[PDB]
Symmetry: D2
Subunit: 414 residues, 4 copies
Amino acid sequence: PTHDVVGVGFGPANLSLAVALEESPAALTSAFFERRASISWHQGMLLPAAKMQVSFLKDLATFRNPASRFSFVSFLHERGRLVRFANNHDFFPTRREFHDYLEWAESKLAHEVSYDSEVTAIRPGPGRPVDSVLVDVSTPEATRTVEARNIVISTGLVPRMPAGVQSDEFVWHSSRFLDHFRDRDPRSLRRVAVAGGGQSAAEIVRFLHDNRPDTVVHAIMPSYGYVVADNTPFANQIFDPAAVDDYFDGSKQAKDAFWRYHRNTNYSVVDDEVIRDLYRRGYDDEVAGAPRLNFVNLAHVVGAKRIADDTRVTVYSMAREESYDLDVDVLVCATGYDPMDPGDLLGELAEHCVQDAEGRWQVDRDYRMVTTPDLRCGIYLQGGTEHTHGLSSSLLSNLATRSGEIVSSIERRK
Amino acid sequence: PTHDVVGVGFGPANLSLAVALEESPAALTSAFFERRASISWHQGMLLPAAKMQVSFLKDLATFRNPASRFSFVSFLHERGRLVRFANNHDFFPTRREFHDYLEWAESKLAHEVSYDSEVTAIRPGPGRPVDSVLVDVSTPEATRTVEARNIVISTGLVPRMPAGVQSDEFVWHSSRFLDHFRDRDPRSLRRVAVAGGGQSAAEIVRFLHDNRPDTVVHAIMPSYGYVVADNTPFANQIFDPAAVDDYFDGSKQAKDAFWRYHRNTNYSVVDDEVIRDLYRRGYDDEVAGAPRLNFVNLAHVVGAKRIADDTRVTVYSMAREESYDLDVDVLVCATGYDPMDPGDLLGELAEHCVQDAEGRWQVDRDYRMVTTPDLRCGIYLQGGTEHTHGLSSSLLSNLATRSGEIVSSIERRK
Amino acid sequence: PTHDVVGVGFGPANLSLAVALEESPAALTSAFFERRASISWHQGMLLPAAKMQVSFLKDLATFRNPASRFSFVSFLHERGRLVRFANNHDFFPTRREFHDYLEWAESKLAHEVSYDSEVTAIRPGPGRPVDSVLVDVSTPEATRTVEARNIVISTGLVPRMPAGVQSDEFVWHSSRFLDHFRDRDPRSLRRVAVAGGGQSAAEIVRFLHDNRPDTVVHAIMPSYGYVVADNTPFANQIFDPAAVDDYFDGSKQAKDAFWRYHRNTNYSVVDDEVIRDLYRRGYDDEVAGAPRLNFVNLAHVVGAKRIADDTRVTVYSMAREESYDLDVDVLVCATGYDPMDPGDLLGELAEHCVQDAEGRWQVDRDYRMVTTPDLRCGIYLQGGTEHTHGLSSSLLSNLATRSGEIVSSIERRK
Amino acid sequence: PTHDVVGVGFGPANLSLAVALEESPAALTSAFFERRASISWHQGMLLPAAKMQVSFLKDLATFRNPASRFSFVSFLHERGRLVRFANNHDFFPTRREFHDYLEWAESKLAHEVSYDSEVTAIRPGPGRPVDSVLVDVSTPEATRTVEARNIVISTGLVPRMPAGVQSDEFVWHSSRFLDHFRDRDPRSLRRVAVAGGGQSAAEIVRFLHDNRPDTVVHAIMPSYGYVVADNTPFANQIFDPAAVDDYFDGSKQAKDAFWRYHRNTNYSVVDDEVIRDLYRRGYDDEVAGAPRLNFVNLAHVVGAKRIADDTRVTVYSMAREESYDLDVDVLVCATGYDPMDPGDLLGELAEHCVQDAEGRWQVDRDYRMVTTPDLRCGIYLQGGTEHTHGLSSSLLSNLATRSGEIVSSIERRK
Ligand SMILES: Cc1cc2c(cc1C)N(C[C@H](O)[C@H](O)[C@H](O)COP(=O)(O)OP(=O)(O)OC[C@H]1O[C@@H](n3cnc4c(N)ncnc43)[C@H](O)[C@@H]1O)c1[nH]c(=O)[nH]c(=O)c1N2
Ligand SMILES: Cc1cc2c(cc1C)N(C[C@H](O)[C@H](O)[C@H](O)COP(=O)(O)OP(=O)(O)OC[C@H]1O[C@@H](n3cnc4c(N)ncnc43)[C@H](O)[C@@H]1O)c1[nH]c(=O)[nH]c(=O)c1N2
Ligand SMILES: Cc1cc2c(cc1C)N(C[C@H](O)[C@H](O)[C@H](O)COP(=O)(O)OP(=O)(O)OC[C@H]1O[C@@H](n3cnc4c(N)ncnc43)[C@H](O)[C@@H]1O)c1[nH]c(=O)[nH]c(=O)c1N2
Ligand SMILES: Cc1cc2c(cc1C)N(C[C@H](O)[C@H](O)[C@H](O)COP(=O)(O)OP(=O)(O)OC[C@H]1O[C@@H](n3cnc4c(N)ncnc43)[C@H](O)[C@@H]1O)c1[nH]c(=O)[nH]c(=O)c1N2
Ligand SMILES: NC(=O)c1ccc[n+]([C@@H]2O[C@H](COP(=O)([O-])OP(=O)(O)OC[C@H]3O[C@@H](n4cnc5c(N)ncnc54)[C@H](OP(=O)(O)O)[C@@H]3O)[C@@H](O)[C@H]2O)c1
Ligand SMILES: NC(=O)c1ccc[n+]([C@@H]2O[C@H](COP(=O)([O-])OP(=O)(O)OC[C@H]3O[C@@H](n4cnc5c(N)ncnc54)[C@H](OP(=O)(O)O)[C@@H]3O)[C@@H](O)[C@H]2O)c1
Ligand SMILES: NC(=O)c1ccc[n+]([C@@H]2O[C@H](COP(=O)([O-])OP(=O)(O)OC[C@H]3O[C@@H](n4cnc5c(N)ncnc54)[C@H](OP(=O)(O)O)[C@@H]3O)[C@@H](O)[C@H]2O)c1
Ligand SMILES: [Br-]
Ligand SMILES: [Br-]
Ligand SMILES: [Br-]
Ligand SMILES: [Br-]
Ligand SMILES: [Br-]
Ligand SMILES: [Br-]
Ligand SMILES: [Br-]
Ligand SMILES: [Br-]
Ligand SMILES: [Br-]
Ligand SMILES: [Br-]
Ligand SMILES: [Br-]
Ligand SMILES: [Br-]
Ligand SMILES: [Br-]
Ligand SMILES: [Br-]
Ligand SMILES: [Br-]
Ligand SMILES: [Br-]
Ligand SMILES: [Br-]
Ligand SMILES: [Br-]
Ligand SMILES: [Br-]
Ligand SMILES: [Br-]
Ligand SMILES: [Br-]
Ligand SMILES: [Br-]
Ligand SMILES: [Br-]
Ligand SMILES: [Br-]
Ligand SMILES: [Br-]
Ligand SMILES: [Br-]
Ligand SMILES: [Br-]
Ligand SMILES: [Br-]
Ligand SMILES: [Br-]
Ligand SMILES: [Br-]
Ligand SMILES: [Br-]
Ligand SMILES: [Br-]
Ligand SMILES: [Br-]
Ligand SMILES: [Br-]
Ligand SMILES: [Br-]
């Protein structure tokens, strides 16, 4: 049994793909494999006040199909919370509500996703030219192989630790913050260092500040203060379907300009509202004569070691061009992520995939990897297209159109 | 040929009815009559900056059917403006865009509306009990009569001038502001009086101030300054479908409480942003040493007379308890509207319509007039239900659910 | 030793008076008596997030003297927080910071206030015409009498409980909320009823929601939902110095118009941001499937009784026109305040104070009670002038100008 | 006659110096020379809606002296506009009002400024050690020389045109926009090109769009849309007095970090509000079917030539890597400014001024140029300290403290 398309991973990207498949009149067979027991959308960072960074209109389908049964609005309606939501006049749902939306959409699908199923490799199917791929799937009990004419890789961002710092029992990456934080006896995390100046760093500091009154927090970041995230309307355009065209067709000089001017729309920046809230907290503590937030600016974390009952963080100060130590109970590294790497699961098939001068996967407009004539199977990327398709690659801005484009591509080639 | 339902008037209310009819699986025949040449939704007040007072999610259908082909979101999509609109992050479209939406929805309808068709009377059909009504329709060429088992009256708010003031060539009601303003020579309206403290009054003054630099404006209103419109989420809940029930099923005492506390959600009030804009304009003029906005507070317009080339406005000052005369080129009365009244159109049928103690029409929860057993035809009201259904009656807050309940009622009784 | 002026009470109003006295070139002797141990400015309601309802520019002096050593700006500067405050771009300080400001201003004063000193009576001095008043002061150790040519009564708002509800250990007035709440066992206040729809009611509910995850709260109020406080620039003009004149010189009809239209600037209303925050909390709880905020609208508390371990609150529902019982651990009545009344303190002197038709004190523009020729001493009111001077009487909007006018009046008559 | 200090230029910077001198108890003689007829603070860009980029609290003196007779608040009070201003709740005055403030402050000043007086050179005074400088002043009638022990150079930003483009009758720099625009016939500027993506560019485009309904505008900028200006509280800390020290004492690495992360607080960026307003304008035009704003992104103006009745603008597109022409009536270059440079004015004294490795002027913390032993006179810079003191150098953020430090330095050396 050969599937038209197999999806690796089941986060929002492949979920929108599943939705696109179901709404398409094309009869395409599919299977999706997710390593986790269920949809798990950055749960480590599902903090109490966390808000979506995108508008609810930017959901799984609406931009493609304004009357989708899978729209966020449909979700609200079924949950009897559309009227209440509209009264709030906030375009940005909470992360918690959105996570619910995902699970609701997944349930509504006719198709059934295979959970607890980790794709370990993707191999050339039999014959030349290669007309199918073999997908090696590991479940807790067994292992098996499924065959597919096309494959869509959507395995998500990859946590990035500072150079020279390894995650450990008292050194956490932000992605696994709540995982670790639930364990730990409250009276044992009185001193926390948080590395980073981005959205993750800010949210974690805010959470620590609100959730227990006596925690002392060291916010260590290279900038002089949080840099504001740019969500102004002209800016939000870089995420419009048509802007993806602009970026794709543009010269390397144009692509650079994109990053040079508009990297602030997403990377190493903090939403305006979160910034103000942190500032208000700092101000009120000063008034109360009880400072707890220590902003260590123009600095990086360059090392961590456990010494007795204290995690010793080595900080490099740019202002003084000197390193020094910082003893705390826990170091949380909110130091960001690396892009999805298409090459991960590809071994041999990577031989048939085409790189450019600088070594990067070549990708067609329809998110399909460029291959030699030895490969006729479609390898599509949702994620890992930062170089070719732009800033929207890892984000939720363009789920509907990207998924739709991929489905159409697959139908066209069938 | 007897129709299941005939709609009198084709503003947003009956348009949502037409949509509800089309989306309903029930096979109901219908005709709609509009006296104008086309949909004309308060065009006299389609000022440059005018913004909807209701969220785009409150459209013709979405609250009833979250995936309607007639949703505002569908409209944006077809116009290729959904992405752009979402980037704006504003829940409130312009009046101009919304007017487009209505025309777009009307065109989509399978059914064809009869324009240039004024309903002049509604009369008892033949027989007893009365099982149909006769609808007298006047077109430019002819007159005719069509028969219907149910009728839905939605003829809109009725302009209300101040007592003792009649509309005239230099005394206008706000509803016909642009109609009269586009005609006049700019250099002839250097002095304008605007009566009222509501949304209409404020928008007109703002428009006059922005449009031409030398117009002097007298803003005459009973309050000491504009009163802010309440659109905070809890007060807004009075427009929830469920709040209609609360109002309907509530005692007279409870109904009175709605008006006493929440009349400021709509009547005699001005949107926060419009108020601030006017204030900024006044401030900047003062700085420039060139005042043009004269706020005449705690006052009422009590008369107008044309004297040579001047419109003389008689103003009563509450502070002073005396009247005085104000000479301008034009008096614009933004003094509001009276509710729809099915009274005039009904004639003989009114005999079979039951009134309450205070002589008002009794109306069922499904918007259907209470009748004697002599009358079995449904007379539904969209508008004119302020006293039975509450503050949502004349507004856009509840189009989807009201229209849906009327359609269901008609189907149930068939 | 006869003082030119004696101040009864030392809240913000008399503090601004003290400041006005010191800044005036006039050499006037004074004494101030405060019953409490120190300045105590609604400490029972000093909740964590509470924000001033008035701009920092509306402080003790700035409107009168734009370069006062007692300005809020001077306070920030001395505290080394001015730059930090300006960066925040918020016109509204916290209540906690403002309380600090008051104490700071009090300390800076040359004059020394007499604390722990309750004024128990004000009596006619010796002679005719009565030329001085005698002020009976009770300290913890002794009692004494001081003599003054003028007296300024500023004893503040008086807590008002719902009719037929008396405060006790499980039935609190909002004014003493933190007094009772602190140290009460957390696990013993799992069910709280809060009566009222005003700023106090809203802040307490929000605090309860924020500070304890388990607490179930019943918000009981006569309106259908919180009514927004009007702070828009034009309505806010009623607090301008010149608007005091407009109100004072205006007819009874005009005065009524102020209250009819602009009572929503202060009474029985809630700040926009606090409303939205409560709504967001309610929404998120619904999403989480854990409702805790119960809004009991169109209702009022009509009785309370202690029954075993429960406080039984009798609620009257306007919608149903019936009464029912609600069991909670504590009833907090945030039911507002009555105006200051010089009546009690005055005794005999009241004979020489002229009343108008409705039993109310006549007051001159300069806040000086109207007296018979039998009395030449100045009795000034800061507070209790709602009926003569308007909505600014109990508020912080006009401290600088009122205090300045009182000082000037006293100097003029000397 | 030898002055303690001579100021070159009389914009806000030297105005604050004059104020600092006055308020200082030190008896220092001074003269100020301005080449214009009066204070002329970027009048070419005094557009109708233009708003200060800095809080009113950041005025001539307040941060140094919180009760200055020259504060913005004092200004408002004297103008009888303090109450009205506070009611507006806007920290940011209009540029128009601020310009008034400057003139008002100038008039208050006890000592008189010499207008129509252009400093043409600064020379070594006679003898050894060099204890004075000679200032060559050219008035319309005569020329003269004044002597001073110290000199403060504050001659402002210098307009910068694109490379290969020269200002002309139909090619304007933004700084002279209104100067040229008030002259031209309206019907002759139907096609305008505006180069730049900064605050100047945005304001001019907005003005052109609002002013006349039929102007077509080409907005040419290197970014893919306007980049938001960062004004959030933490990033704004870079303008704190203490942040000057951090920048000054910091390594080159640290200084680079300030620019790398926080350049977006001021350069090549646009205020949030202005961006949103432009976007709304674009949206409404599309709805109206009448587009007029053409955003030419990822592009640079590289040339301009007059050809008959057309200004032909050569545009380089980074996306296509090619150049093309656009014909308009006028090209406005809003392409920014170069820093103040004491270089030109200094001449021979420059020999006595020490440069660093990269050939830049070495400046002490007090703003005083580093000199050779023979030179004992103080040469202070207000402006032109970007490389030593940081991003505050050309701005209004720090007038009070900088001026105060310079005055103190002069007194201390005296
Ligand atoms: C805390 C936080 C919050 C947000 C965001 C990031 C972070 C860290 N993002 C960006 C983020 O990339 C986005 O929200 C989604 O996670 C992207 O969807 P994906 O399906 O592509 O990755 P995603 O990570 O969601 O899905 C990957 C899945 O594949 C599974 N998987 C990986 N390898 C596998 C294998 N070998 N076999 C089987 N399964 C495998 C993983 O288990 C995982 O479930 C965002 N962006 C935005 O625009 N707005 C927003 O609000 C947010 N919110
Ligand atoms: C300037 C302005 C702006 C707004 C609003 C009012 C005003 C004055 N409204 C309220 C307004 O009532 C609502 O928007 C609709 O007009 C109501 O729809 P009807 O369909 O009920 O009115 P209208 O929309 O008033 O429908 C009546 C129509 O029937 C026609 N008609 C009358 N008599 C007839 C006859 N005898 N025969 C045939 N046709 C006849 C009329 O010609 C008219 O077209 C509003 N509310 C809100 O909630 N949000 C908002 O943004 C606005 N905007
Ligand atoms: C929780 C809360 C918060 C606010 C406000 C009210 C409340 C309840 N207000 C209004 C409030 O009225 C105002 O802030 C001041 O309290 C009024 O000053 P007095 O100085 O007039 O009152 P208070 O400030 O009430 O002055 C009274 C003092 O006199 C003392 N006293 C009474 N009788 C005495 C006696 N016989 N002998 C000696 N001393 C006696 C009392 O002890 C007390 O210290 C307000 N308004 C606004 O415009 N903005 C705001 O932010 C707020 N904030
Ligand atoms: C349109 C616009 C608007 C703003 C700003 C810039 C621009 C272009 N700025 C920055 C701007 O640099 C600042 O507002 C002041 O102009 C700087 O003060 P200066 O006194 O140093 O220069 P400024 O240019 O104001 O004054 C210099 C003066 O010296 C005179 N002069 C020059 N050479 C001379 C000579 N040889 N002899 C005699 N006189 C001579 C000139 O005539 C001129 O009047 C700003 N920044 C901010 O933080 N907030 C804001 O709101 C603004 N607003
Ligand atoms: N509420 C939400 O929906 C939410 C929450 C969290 C994250 N997200 C999303 O997830 C994505 C990533 O955000 P992110 O904050 O996790 O990552 P991020 O944007 O890459 O931010 C990483 C930060 O850590 C800094 N850093 C790197 N090495 C460091 C070191 N050795 N010491 C100190 N700081 C160091 C980076 O500084 P430099 O770049 O200057 O080197 C940067 O400030 C974004 O798309 C974001 O929007 C969303
Ligand atoms: N942008 C939009 O979508 C828009 C624009 C305009 C209107 N509308 C809507 O249309 C409806 C009507 O609003 P409206 O502003 O036209 O009317 P309105 O709300 O009824 O207000 C009428 C005003 O005139 C005053 N008034 C009455 N008699 C007067 C007199 N003799 N002299 C001076 N003033 C007098 C009223 O004062 P009192 O009430 O105190 O007596 C009131 O302030 C509302 O639903 C509104 O939201 C919407
Ligand atoms: N309302 C106000 O108070 C107000 C008004 C206007 C200005 N200002 C102030 O004045 C100062 C300067 O602002 P500004 O906007 O005048 O200048 P600016 O910040 O320097 O911005 C100049 C812009 O022109 C661009 N540019 C450079 N060469 C170009 C070319 N050949 N073709 C097209 N575009 C080109 C720059 O792009 P790149 O830099 O990316 O190369 C940049 O976006 C700031 O302090 C600003 O805040 C204040
Ligand atoms: Br968005
Ligand atoms: Br719903
Ligand atoms: Br690193
Ligand atoms: Br560890
Ligand atoms: Br970890
Ligand atoms: Br949190
Ligand atoms: Br492009
Ligand atoms: Br540290
Ligand atoms: Br796409
Ligand atoms: Br698509
Ligand atoms: Br709404
Ligand atoms: Br679209
Ligand atoms: Br009319
Ligand atoms: Br307008
Ligand atoms: Br109810
Ligand atoms: Br309904
Ligand atoms: Br329905
Ligand atoms: Br205020
Ligand atoms: Br400070
Ligand atoms: Br109590
Ligand atoms: Br709180
Ligand atoms: Br619930
Ligand atoms: Br007063
Ligand atoms: Br005064
Ligand atoms: Br403008
Ligand atoms: Br600022
Ligand atoms: Br004033
Ligand atoms: Br250039
Ligand atoms: Br040039
Ligand atoms: Br030219
Ligand atoms: Br020029
Ligand atoms: Br530093
Ligand atoms: Br030519
Ligand atoms: Br400094
Ligand atoms: Br200083």
